[PDB]
Design a protein around this ligand. Structure first.
Ligand SMILES: Nc1ncnc2c1ncn2[C@@H]1O[C@H](COP(=O)(O)OP(=O)(O)OP(=O)(O)O)[C@@H](O)[C@H]1O
Ligand SMILES: Nc1ncnc2c1ncn2[C@@H]1O[C@H](COP(=O)(O)OP(=O)(O)OP(=O)(O)O)[C@@H](O)[C@H]1O
Lengths: 695, 192, 296
């Protein structure tokens, strides 16, 4: 095996022995984690590679003291990597803690919650996980050059809530999956930096003396890279046609998959692993790559090619900017909070290299092409693109095709023919799992992108996360239906609802984070993963009982559209369920408006807690609904006269409203409560809102 | 090249209903006073003056969609409540909008389903401005004859919805015609 | 070097891509186009007011506060509160250029920036077979903006005194035409007043090293290489149709043109030019690209 792949396959399993010791029913070597893990991996044909066994068995100082390994043996990089990612009585039942508590615990420290109140884990669980991983390791896992992403996926599937270090004296918030992933990432970066910079006897380069060791932490061997999609909003919100629902779910997905293919292709160029990706979503992506001249030269060339492409189709609507910054490993161990400095510095370099975007010859070429062009796509508000039948270009029709194909099929394939046009001379088509398999033994150079589906284990199984829900398919006709399919609800006015939400404390949370003591790469990485998985699974589950289709969701943007009443109810449910998952540390701000059917959705988008739930919805709305339910003949006329009196805030109007309520036939309690509320400004505004909701 | 200004005020003889909201009526989203759009004036005037007969219709309002292009020669703006109507309604304490309750009768069933349609108050006054871009000297007499006949027709017709059902009758008072650009005389042109 | 103040009293549609779109301010492209069309309608001579007049974009005002765009200058600290901000009044502009603006001040300035609101007015078109027989109406939408009783837009123009006298005459002609989209349907008339504000004059007549581009410009072919040495800028595809060029309006459409936005910052000044976007036409069609520089 390539020595880099040896680092990969060994590193990602360095602390495997922990799950084995913690098991207790699998403690063959009750001495140290290293020897036990070494013994466990040593029965299986595929992972019968020996140097991987050395890597796993020697991940710690004491063991390495006597292994007499070569001055070049991959395990040494593993040692430094685990140290970088990082009195010692490990309690096997230690419950994992959610990072979200600690984030804003500086202001308000709440009772540390935990995953599965005072929960505790038990021994047999680990034994079961041992069984499961032996099963997958005999039947699903196999060793080849290209299966490393699959190994990473299975680690992701099995370990995301098994605590990594169970030290009683440390704030336990790292899953073993996170520890393993970041260790593998750092190991890859170290290997490239050392191999490129003409050092081979790594035992003497690193391990020899702690002062020399400390220098290696100080050498700037790492580069952090950033990405940013420029023109999200105007590309996603330039729709006027009749397939508003169908396009938007598809345009949003096409842009998302564009970001994903860019990042994957870049990683392929730099010969790095999928682990080095730390965050994707929205338009940003962060990559941790090697600090070599080779890597930087490739990055410059790849930026050139990408920018030339994006000019060759869009020219203002979409562009990508990348920037990188030297950083030293000493900064990754939260030595002087300098992680925050370097992270802000790369952010500034990005925000200031999005200024100078086009060279001189570029802007000349943009302005001097006198070309015979037709006019603007009805669906896609764009002139430059070249229309065809029904006043639609080829790209918009491909978007419509992928829109039709979304609901029934789940796997997404990157191939040379496809349907939609992908950056580096590729295309996407759509298939099913049997078809995916058939492509797999065909050995086509393919990647599979899925609809939130693990347990794939198929070729390049890449469980990309995207919240695809639509109540429109729950009707008797499974085919996707238009925006009128929610308008035509008779339980209230035939109108639409749209909701937008932003995390208020998210800039600080990814940047400031937990102060002065938990600011490693590992801990911010796990926080990122937690927020991402929340917005890419939990929405799908939470939205089930609601007549809503999910448009764009992820990062910190929540964009859902559906029936009026349903949008309000789902918004309240989502706010509460979020406050649960963030342990009441992070807040959401959201806006919901009433928009009539058949409006150009590009135009409705540009228009768009405890108080509203407890005071308005729960008390006033309920008593009002009961009041009208008990007493008939109170049609929209009576309610609207109530409005007519209320909105004009005058005392003579208060007397008139008293007369009107007297002429009604409600129970004395209802009338009395209404009149008492009407006497008070806050209460009367709330009453106005509540009765307006009644209609 | 001169620009002729036709200004005046229009009274709502019977209640008016433009109802862009529907059944609300068009308003301004801050002042909360109703307005009467220029599009309404122009559309109804065009329909009437055309049904009266063409080239003149193309001349006054301009179509430019039939393989030849003609620029609009009459510009119509919106109208708004005058200060006089506002002060009068305030002093006498009159609301600005009336709401009429209506009803429908089914046949073979005789169950009534009611409606609720909002209507601008009788007596309200709207101030309007028209502009005439005289691009040809030798046609101003003809074009004001046409606009005279159009206004005469609108006097005897309705604006907005439900006019067959009894609303929208308007009146035109206090029209003055002044020349505001150029050196063309307008002391002989006439509009009721 | 006078400035013009525009009051409207009728809602205006200004447009970016579709008739249901609404925009608050417009650029020197549309302004210069309007002045040109009114000059031709008047039958006056066009050479004088072609190659001597410099116009800045439109910039909004409130009761007694005047506004200019945000310089895209590199401030080294949130990177959030400044992003949501577009315009900075004349009082605090030098403060912004020299870092004397604080985050709470940014929140306050944003809070005070209520200078108009947006709306969509619905309309129907019954010229269709509803005239003839059973046939649905075809509702369409328009996008409008309305200013509060003490808002509007303003210009900054400079040139010889004779050029400014001509500009005054043409503006008097224009105040009774429109400055927007659906002019003939009842949108966009205005009354204008010429006022000399001491502070804006002071701001315009400084001397510095940077430059803030207040209009939309594009350097000529032979100066762009040295023009773009150190700059921070945004490009905008500016498109649109033309009025009375060939037979079919739908067939005639200006070639797309890109120009720097109205906030870009430059080291080396460039003069602009009135660029043709013309082809397949009976007369040249002009687009405007000449900068009005603010030197600090
Ligand atoms: N497909 C999408 N549809 C809708 N919103 C999206 C989509 N992808 C991302 N977004 C959200 O839209 C927000 C606004 O994107 P925007 O156009 O402002 O781009 P940006 O990355 O912030 O660049 P810029 O700084 O130039 O504005 C993003 O921050 C993201 O949360
Ligand atoms: N998990 C995340 N990790 C890192 N950055 C994130 C994450 N989620 C969202 N973001 C960032 O948030 C941006 C979205 O900006 P948006 O305007 O929606 O809100 P914001 O400015 O972050 O929020 P606020 O101003 O309320 O703090 C994305 O472009 C991205 O850079």
């Amino acid at each position: 095996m390539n020595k880099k792949n040896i680092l990969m396959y060994g590193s990602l399993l360095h602390d495997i022995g922990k799950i084995i010791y913690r098991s207790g029913d699998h403690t063959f070597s009750r001495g140290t984690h290293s020897k036990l893990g070494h013994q466990f991996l040593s029965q299986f044909s595929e992972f019968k590679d020996n140097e991987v066994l050395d890597n796993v068995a020697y991940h710690h100082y004491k063991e390495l003291a006597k292994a007499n390994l070569d001055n070049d043996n991959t395990a040494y990089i593993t040692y430094i990597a685990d140290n970088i990612a990082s009195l010692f009585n490990f309690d096997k039942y230690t419950p994992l803690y959610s990072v979200f508590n600690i984030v804003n615990s500086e202001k308000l420290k709440q009772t540390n919650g935990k995953f599965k109140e005072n929960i505790q884990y038990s021994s047999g669980n680990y034994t079961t996980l041992m069984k499961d991983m032996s099963h997958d390791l005999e039947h699903k896992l196999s060793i080849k050059e290209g299966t490393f992403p699959s190994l990473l996926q299975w680690t992701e599937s099995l370990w995301q809530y098994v605590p990594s270090s169970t030290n009683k004296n440390q704030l336990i918030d790292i899953s073993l999956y996170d520890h393993s992933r970041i260790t593998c990432a750092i190991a890859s970066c170290i290997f490239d930096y050392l191999n490129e910079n003409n050092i081979h006897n790594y035992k003497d380069e690193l391990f020899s003396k702690y002062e020399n060791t400390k220098s290696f932490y100080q050498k700037e061997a790492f580069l952090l890279l950033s990405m940013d999609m420029s023109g999200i909003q105007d590309f996603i919100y330039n729709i006027s046609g009749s397939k508003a629902l169908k396009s938007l779910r598809s345009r949003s997905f096409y842009l998302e998959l564009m970001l994903e293919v860019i990042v994957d292709q870049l990683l392929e160029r730099l010969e790095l692993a999928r682990a080095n990706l730390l965050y994707t979503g929205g338009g940003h992506a962060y990559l941790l790559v090697s600090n070599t001249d080779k890597v930087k030269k490739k990055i410059t060339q790849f930026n050139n090619e990408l920018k030339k492409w994006f000019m060759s189709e869009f020219t203002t609507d979409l562009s990508l900017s990348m920037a990188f910054e030297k950083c030293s490993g000493d900064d990754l161990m939260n030595t002087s909070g300098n992680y925050r400095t370097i992270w802000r510095n790369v952010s500034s370099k990005l925000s200031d290299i999005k200024a100078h975007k086009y060279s001189a010859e570029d802007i000349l070429k943009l302005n001097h092409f006198h070309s015979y062009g037709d006019r603007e796509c009805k669906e896609c508000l764009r002139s430059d693109i070249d229309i065809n039948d029904d006043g639609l270009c080829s790209i918009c029709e491909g978007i419509i095709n992928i829109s039709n194909d979304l609901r029934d099929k789940s796997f997404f394939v990157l191939s040379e023919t496809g349907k939609l046009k992908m950056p580096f001379n590729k295309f996407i088509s759509v298939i099913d799992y049997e078809e995916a398999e058939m492509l797999v033994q065909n050995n086509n150079q393919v990647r599979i992108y899925s609809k939130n589906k693990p347990y794939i284990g198929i070729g390049i199984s890449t469980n990309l996360w995207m919240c695809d829900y639509d109540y429109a398919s729950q009707n008797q006709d499974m085919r996707e239906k238009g925006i009128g399919s929610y308008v035509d609800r008779e339980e209230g006015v035939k109108r639409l609802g749209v909701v937008r939400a932003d995390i208020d404390n998210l800039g600080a949370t990814f940047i400031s984070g937990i102060p002065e003591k938990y600011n490693s790469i590992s801990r911010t990485a796990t926080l990122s993963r937690q927020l991402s998985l929340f917005f890419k699974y939990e929405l799908n589950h939470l939205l089930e009982n609601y007549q809503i289709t999910a448009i764009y969701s992820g990062g910190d943007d929540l964009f859902l559209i559906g029936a009026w009443d349903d949008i309000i109810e789902a918004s309240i449910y989502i706010n509460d369920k979020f406050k649960e998952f963030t342990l009441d540390k992070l807040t959401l701000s959201a806006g919901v408006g009433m928009f009539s059917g058949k409006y150009p959705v590009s135009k409705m988008a540009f228009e768009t807690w405890d108080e509203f739930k407890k005071n308005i919805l729960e008390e006033k709305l309920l008593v009002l609904q009961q009041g009208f339910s008990q007493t008939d003949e109170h049609g929209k006329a009576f309610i609207y006269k109530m409005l007519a009196l209320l909105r004009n805030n005058e005392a003579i109007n208060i007397a008139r409203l008293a007369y009107l309520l007297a002429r009604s036939k409600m129970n004395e309690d209802f009338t009395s409560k209404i009149f008492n509320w009407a006497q008070n400004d806050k209460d009367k505004n709330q009453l106005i809102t509540a009765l307006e909701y009644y209609i | 090249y001169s620009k002729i200004k036709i200004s005046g005020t229009i009274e709502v003889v019977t209640g008016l209903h433009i109802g862009g909201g529907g059944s609300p009526v068009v308003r301004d989203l801050q002042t909360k006073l109703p307005i009467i759009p220029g599009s309404s004036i122009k559309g109804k005037m065009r329909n009437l003056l055309a049904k009266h007969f063409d080239e003149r219709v193309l001349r006054l309002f301009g179509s430019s969609e039939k393989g030849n292009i003609q620029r609009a020669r009459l510009q119509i703006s919106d109208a708004f409540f005058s200060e006089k109507t506002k002060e009068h309604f305030a002093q006498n304490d009159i609301a600005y909008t009336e709401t009429k309750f209506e009803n429908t009768i089914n046949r073979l069933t005789a169950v009534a389903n009611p409606r609720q349609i909002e209507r601008v108050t009788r007596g309200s006054e709207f101030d309007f401005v028209f502009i005439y871009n005289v691009d040809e000297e030798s046609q101003v007499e003809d074009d004001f004859e046409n606009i005279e006949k159009a206004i005469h027709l609108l006097e005897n017709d309705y604006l907005g919805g439900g006019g067959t059902r009894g609303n929208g009758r308007i009146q035109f008072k206090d029209t003055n015609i002044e020349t505001v650009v150029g050196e063309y005389d307008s002391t002989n042109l006439k509009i009721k | 070097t006078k400035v013009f103040k525009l009051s409207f009293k009728t809602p205006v549609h200004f447009g970016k891509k579709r008739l249901s779109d609404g925009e608050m301010t417009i650029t020197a492209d549309t302004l210069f186009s309007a002045l040109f069309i009114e000059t031709l309608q008047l039958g006056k001579d066009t050479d004088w007011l072609l190659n001597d007049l410099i116009i800045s974009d439109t910039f909004p005002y409130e009761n007694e506060l005047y506004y200019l765009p945000k310089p895209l200058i590199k401030i080294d600290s949130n990177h959030k509160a400044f992003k949501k901000l577009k315009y900075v009044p004349v009082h605090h502009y030098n403060q912004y250029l020299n870092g004397e603006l604080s985050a709470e001040d940014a929140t306050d300035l944003n809070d005070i920036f209520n200078i108009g609101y947006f709306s969509l007015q619905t309309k129907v078109s019954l010229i269709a077979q509803e005239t003839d027989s059973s046939a649905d109406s075809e509702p369409y939408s328009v996008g409008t903006f309305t200013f509060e009783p003490e808002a509007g837009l303003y210009f900054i123009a400079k040139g010889s005194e004779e050029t400014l006298d001509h500009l005054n005459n043409i503006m008097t002609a224009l105040q009774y035409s429109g400055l927007g989209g659906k002019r003939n349907a009842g949108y966009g008339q205005f009354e204008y007043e010429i006022i000399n504000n001491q502070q804006l004059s002071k701001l315009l007549n400084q001397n510095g090293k940077h430059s803030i581009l207040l209009s939309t410009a594009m350097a000529k072919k032979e100066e762009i290489e040295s023009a773009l040495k150190e700059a921070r800028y945004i490009l905008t595809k500016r498109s649109g149709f033309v009025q009375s060029t060939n037979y079919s309006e739908m067939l005639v459409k200006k070639s797309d043109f890109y120009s720097f936005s109205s906030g870009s910052v430059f080291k080396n000044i460039f003069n602009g030019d009135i660029f043709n976007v013309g082809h397949n036409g009976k007369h040249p069609v002009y687009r405007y690209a000449k900068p009005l520089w603010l030197e600090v």
